[PDB]
């Protein structure tokens, strides 16, 4: 089966240059091209280019032209995109997507996984973690992870084995520039005085792990 | 030049029942050879986008039957006939006849259910996180549906605008329910010049706006 691979994930500055790449496994012949696609977070697909790579000609969107350049290595089968001068507006997933053609319209249309992209001026840093702590039928507890950079940041419950009714809620940017983010639990009220609840929050670019058991507290 | 617009914007489907997803170009999408080569993609949450459909109605390969494109000119419509679990996501229609290309802004179908209010749950900073400065008040709003729902803040009955944060899960597996998490940042400083703080929620399922509160240091 013909597949895409894209290079990791990148966590830049403001004013540096990136170059992302995408490589064609599995399939010989030339007649493909290769098309990046923008996607910001929450949002919908943009075209920004495609490349011809037989002969390199290339079409970009009039919204990228002069922000980003296409190139190719037929010798390796593998596509770039490059920005010379990057922008926090740059953070995005960007995904290569390969058209098999047979002049002709018609082609078959093989994604890539998607590369997400970080443009910041923040630095890493691990996170705070802090107990919800329940209060006074169902309860609701959970930890809110504060104050981390890059993204991720990976949480679970007693050690996995707290599965069921876990809401980890998506990450958002604070004004910091750092990411804060909450997981919650709801459980029995009875199992508050029986049992103990300890979220376990990852941060692997800071090699930070954090174990904090939420109490109810007074 | 070619302008796709796509609509609606979200389709709550019943599962089994069907979903039409339409897309319209500002102009004629017939090619001059007299072909129409309008695309279709599907992307799962978290997924890359994959496509279902080329040249307006034929199937790429693997795509089962109940996905049938249709339209002709300006006018197209994507159809699925038996919506099911495995087909939540958002779905493109992709405009590559005329330079330049560009997708339809996207249909997001979630899974039709019956209303169900929001349980509301507020959480007062926990002391470690004052220790460092900065307190956040966090307002869950678990298991809901539909997405739609408002989230006010007050502090000594006076209203906040600015200084929240909000935060969505995706359309749940099991339940096919939502949750929101606000958060409400403030200064250690503020925090303790002001005694009662209060989360106010607005939802379909609610008959009046519920209000969840605390007082800084019960």
Redesign the interface.
Not at chain 2, 99 to 106: A, D, E, N, R, V
Not at chain 2, 165 to 169: D, M, N, P
């Given at each position: 089966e013909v597949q895409l691979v894209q290079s990791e994930a990148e966590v830049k500055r403001p004013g540096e240059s990136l170059k992302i790449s995408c490589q064609t496994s599995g399939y010989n012949f030339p007649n493909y091209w290769i098309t990046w696609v923008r996607q910001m977070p929450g949002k919908g697909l943009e075209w920004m280019g495609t490349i011809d790579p037989r002969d390199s000609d290339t079409k970009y969107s009039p919204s990228f032209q002069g922000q980003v350049t296409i190139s190719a290595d037929k010798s390796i089968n593998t596509a770039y995109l490059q920005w010379t001068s990057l922008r926090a507006s740059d953070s995005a997933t960007y995904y290569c997507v390969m058209w098999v053609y047979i002049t002709g319209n018609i082609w078959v249309d093989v994604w890539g996984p998607g590369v997400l992209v970080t443009v910041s001026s923040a630095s890493t840093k691990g996170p705070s973690v802090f107990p919800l702590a329940p209060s006074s039928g169902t309860a609701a507890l959970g930890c809110l992870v504060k104050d981390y950079f890059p993204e991720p940041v990976t949480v679970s419950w007693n050690s996995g084995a707290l599965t069921s009714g876990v809401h980890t809620f998506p990450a958002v940017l604070q004004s910091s520039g750092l990411y804060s983010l909450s997981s919650v639990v709801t459980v029995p009220s009875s199992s508050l005085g029986t049992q103990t609840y300890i979220c376990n929050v990852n941060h692997k670019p800071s090699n930070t792990k954090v174990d904090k058991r939420v109490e109810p507290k007074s | 030049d070619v302008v796709m617009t796509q609509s609606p914007l979200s389709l709550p489907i019943t599962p089994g029942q069907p979903a039409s997803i339409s897309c319209r170009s500002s102009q004629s999408l017939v090619?001059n050879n007299g072909?129409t080569?309008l695309?279709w993609?599907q992307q799962r949450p978290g997924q890359?986008?994959?496509?279902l459909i080329?040249?307006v109605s034929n199937r790429?390969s693997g795509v089962p039957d109940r996905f049938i494109g249709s339209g002709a000119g300006t006018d197209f419509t994507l159809k699925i006939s038996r919506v099911e679990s495995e087909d939540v996501g958002?779905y493109?229609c992709g405009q590559?006849?005329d330079?330049?290309?560009?997708?339809?802004?996207?249909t997001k179908v979630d899974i039709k259910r019956t209303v169900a209010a929001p349980?509301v749950?507020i959480?007062?900073?926990?002391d470690?996180?004052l220790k460092?400065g900065t307190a956040?008040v966090?307002c869950?709003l678990?298991?809901f549906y539909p997405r739609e729902a408002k989230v006010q803040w007050k502090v000594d009955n006076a209203l906040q605008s600015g200084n929240s944060?909000?935060?969505?899960?995706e359309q749940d597996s099991k339940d096919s329910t939502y949750?929101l998490?606000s958060?409400l940042?403030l200064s250690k400083a503020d925090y303790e010049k002001h005694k009662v703080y209060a989360c106010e929620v607005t939802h379909q399922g609610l008959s009046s706006p519920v209000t969840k509160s605390?007082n800084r240091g019960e």
């Open positions: - | 090619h072909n080569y695309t993609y890359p986008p994959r496509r080329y040249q790429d958002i493109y590559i006849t330079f330049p290309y560009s997708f339809g802004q996207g349980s749950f959480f007062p900073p926990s470690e996180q460092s956040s966090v869950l678990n298991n944060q909000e935060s969505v899960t949750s998490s958060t940042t605390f």
